[PDB]
Design a binder for this molecule. Structure first.
Ligand SMILES: *C(=O)/C=C/c1ccc(O)cc1
Length: 122
């Protein structure tokens, strides 16, 4: 499955604990509040987080405070409220990591109650 595919969430809805680690891009699944439900191996390779340790933490408050901004978290919240989260943008991640330019794709999951954040280096 390629980053930014039109129906990426269809493919990832099918994936368990293992298949998500084989993606070529970082993949985080969040609930509506930003709590981390899933976090794959490719994302940990970019950020220096242990995927097994971040589960349950809040992405915007605790893990990724540089994303607590209108440009990221504001766009996330707008999408969980509208029910149609689907946006791609560039961003820099720099909290307890080497400042790293990325491309982000946020997309509602098929559950309707969980939201994907996809990341790749640029
Ligand atoms: C800014 O503080 C970004 C930090 C960050 C982004 C994504 C992650 O999975 C971990 C940390």
């Amino acid at each position: 499955v390629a980053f930014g595919s039109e129906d990426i969430e269809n493919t990832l809805a099918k994936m368990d604990d293992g298949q998500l680690d084989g993606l070529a891009f970082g993949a985080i699944q969040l609930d509506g509040d930003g709590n981390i439900l899933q976090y794959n191996a490719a994302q940990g390779d970019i950020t220096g987080r242990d995927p097994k340790q971040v589960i349950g933490k809040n992405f915007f408050k605790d893990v990724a405070p540089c994303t607590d901004s209108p440009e990221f978290y504001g766009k996330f919240k707008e999408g969980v409220a509208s029910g149609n989260l689907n946006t791609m943008f560039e961003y820099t991640f720099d909290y307890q990591m080497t400042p790293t330019k990325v491309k982000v794709h946020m997309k509602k999951a098929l559950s309707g109650d969980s939201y994907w954040v996809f990341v790749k280096r640029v």
